[PDB]
Design a protein that fits this description.
Two copies of one chain form a homodimer. The first copy, chain A, has one helix and no strands. Chain A is mainly α. Chains A and B meet through helix 1 of A and helix 1 of B.
């Protein structure tokens, strides 16, 4: 009856790991386009 | 013990909810300014 609570939140938690990574890949495309569009900030 | 079972995954699910939201807003920042032909951003 609690085995399912584990399954529900963990299924979502996995998805949250994947969707963040997906939104990070867009953000990484955008920092790449940044340093191509301009000089960009040189923190690293 | 199952009360912690919920809280362990759900606290991580919370963390994931927060950081994704930040990556969404800063992606919308990065996207907006980028194509506007930006120089620098603050993000965080």
């Amino acid at each position: 009856d609690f085995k399912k609570l584990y399954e529900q939140i963990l299924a979502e938690n996995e998805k949250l790991k994947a969707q963040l990574h997906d939104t990070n890949m867009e953000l990484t495309d955008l920092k790449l386009q940044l340093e191509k569009a301009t000089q960009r900030q040189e923190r690293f």
